[model samples]
Target: NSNICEVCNKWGRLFCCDTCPRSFHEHCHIPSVEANKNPWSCIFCRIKTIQERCPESQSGHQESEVLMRQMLPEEQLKCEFLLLKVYCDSKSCFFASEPYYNREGSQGPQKPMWLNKVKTSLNEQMYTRVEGFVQDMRLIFHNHKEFYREDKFTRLGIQVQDIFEKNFRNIFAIQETS
Candidate 1:
């Protein structure tokens, strides 16, 4: 059988995302193969792709799920990467981050003069990259769920969410405008 996961290098039923080559074992990431692909993909990988390519897809009526698996009582991470992706390049995204910064009605310090130039040149580098990461993740989420049932996907979803969140932050933080 050619349905082996490239990530874990295991053999079993797997869901392959057309947009990206990422795969996960059916039992590994989801419950069981369904009638059709769930029109979903990994939220984290979707975001990563969005970070890189920011493809024009992923912006439609697709609702994304950020599943997180838990052993004890099933901890669900409510922060959907899709929502984070939703605010890309908008006032809402910037405003959402407002409370975490310097407490003032004044907006976060505008990009420094040099940074402003860089921002213009790069065309919202950090913003697009962060959004792309979320986009990539949504793709991954869809693909995974295609083969796995919701209940089974819960565990794998948790794992994917945690990984995506950490990596997303790291990518944004490390790629600051010089």
Candidate 2:
């Protein structure tokens, strides 16, 4: 299928990003991608790669845990940022976009989970505690491994888990147990 460019969303000569579905047209990307540098990783993939490889190391940790109903405005902003960062990644939430693939693959009364569900739960104030939200986040990663096994999505989930934990610790100022 002839796909449109991610930058202009218009048909044109496109450079496909090997890491994801995004494509950039010649001179379409900011600073205009150049072959002189390296492979065509879009802004989304680059930022996410940097986040996973290197995260906020400064100990600006505040409160580690709070009730969902009692989240401070600052904490809530970080929570929003966390979701933003997750979805900003190129491989982000493609699993959620077509989750029906998992419906028949598994059996029994399975608990539903996805980034969208987490977002809606946060919006609906469904989480009673911060850890409840944390658990839900990890569940998405877990399901990726359980369902997709060893595909690119599962690998992406692993990196996402790393990024999520780093951000989670920073948000709460939680000390590493190890």
By TM-score, the best candidate is 2
Per-candidate TM equals 0.27, 0.53
Q: Compared with the true structure, what per-residue lDDT tens digits does model 2 show for residues 12-118?
A: 78877767777777554433456765556665565456456546623443434333435444444445456655654556646344364434454422554777777
Candidate that scores best on lDDT: 2
Residue 106 of model 1 has an lDDT of 28
lDDT of each: 0.37, 0.60
Error of 1 at 18 (Å): 1.3
Residue runs of model 1 more than 4 Å from their true location after superposition: 1-3, 30-35, 38-40, 49-178
Model 2 regions more than 4 Å off: 1-72, 96-98, 102-109, 150-153, 176-178
TM-score of 2: 0.53
The positional error of residue 81 in candidate 2, measured at the CA in angstroms, is 1.8
Write candidate 1's Cα lDDT for 59-116 as tens digits: 3321222222221111111123323332232322222221222333323322212212
